[PDB]
């Protein structure tokens, strides 16, 4: 229950591909209340992305089976019930991350870069809630996602270079939000195209440290643009 110890255990867990363990270690580190180092922030993000990603993948599989068993009442009801069980896990994971963000990560962020990083992650995890939201709750969840993305977007444009991997990755995910959650393909394409074009225009702002991340995300942006205009 010492911080440097918790971080070392999270690195062990990562090596062991035990992402539940690794998320629990970094939840405990975050709850100690001090601002996370960049290393600690990336461990937290990697851990929860793997934890929530497993449920999102399972949810898509079962949701697809549910749709393919239309007209097969017993099978479809079993798929529905299993999907709902997975949804409960997914919501609980998202609610944990979103609570860490509200209580510690966003209030403690002393730099523009990490403000953008954590508002992006707030947008992402509300987007994951939106992926499985139905009914009365969905509108407010979508609104929370959009508001977090929008604030991150404004800070990133004011404070970071157009080639910054966090600014580019924010554009990528905000664009996906518009396409998939808001069913707004033209806005999605405009956002992704602008982010790609503004980075192309200032490639001298790349750094040796992060140019591989930047150019990867630029390719993903154009890959989405290609998919959505095909």
């Amino acid at each position: 229950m010492d911080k440097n110890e918790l971080v070392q255990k999270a690195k062990l867990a990562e090596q062991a591909e035990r992402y539940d363990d690794m998320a629990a270690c970094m939840k405990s580190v975050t709850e100690q209340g001090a601002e996370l180092s960049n290393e600690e922030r990336n461990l937290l993000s990697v851990a929860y992305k793997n934890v929530v990603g497993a449920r999102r993948s399972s949810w898509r599989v079962v949701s697809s089976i549910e749709q393919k068993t239309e007209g097969a009442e017993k099978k479809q009801q079993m798929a529905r019930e299993y999907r709902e069980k997975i949804e409960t896990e997914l919501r609980d994971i998202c609610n944990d991350v979103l609570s860490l963000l509200e209580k510690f990560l966003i209030p403690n962020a002393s730099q523009a870069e990490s403000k953008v990083f954590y508002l992006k992650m707030k947008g992402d995890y509300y987007r994951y809630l939106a992926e499985v939201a139905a009914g009365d709750d969905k509108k407010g969840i979508v609104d929370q996602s959009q508001q977090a993305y929008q604030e991150a977007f404004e800070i990133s444009k004011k404070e970071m270079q157009p080639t910054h991997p966090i600014r580019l990755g924010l554009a990528l995910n905000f664009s996906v939000f518009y396409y998939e959650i808001l069913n707004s393909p033209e806005k999605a394409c405009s956002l992704a195209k602008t982010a790609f074009d503004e980075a192309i225009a200032e490639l001298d702002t790349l750094s040796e440290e992060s140019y591989k991340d930047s150019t990867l995300i630029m390719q993903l942006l154009r890959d989405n643009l290609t998919l959505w205009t095909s």
Binding site: N42, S45, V46, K49, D124, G169, L172, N173, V176, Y179, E180, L216, I217, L220, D223, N224, L227, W228
Partner: peptide, 7 residues
């Protein structure tokens, strides 16, 4: 399928 950020 479309991509979001790996991280």
């Amino acid at each position: 399928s479309r991509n979001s950020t790996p991280g």
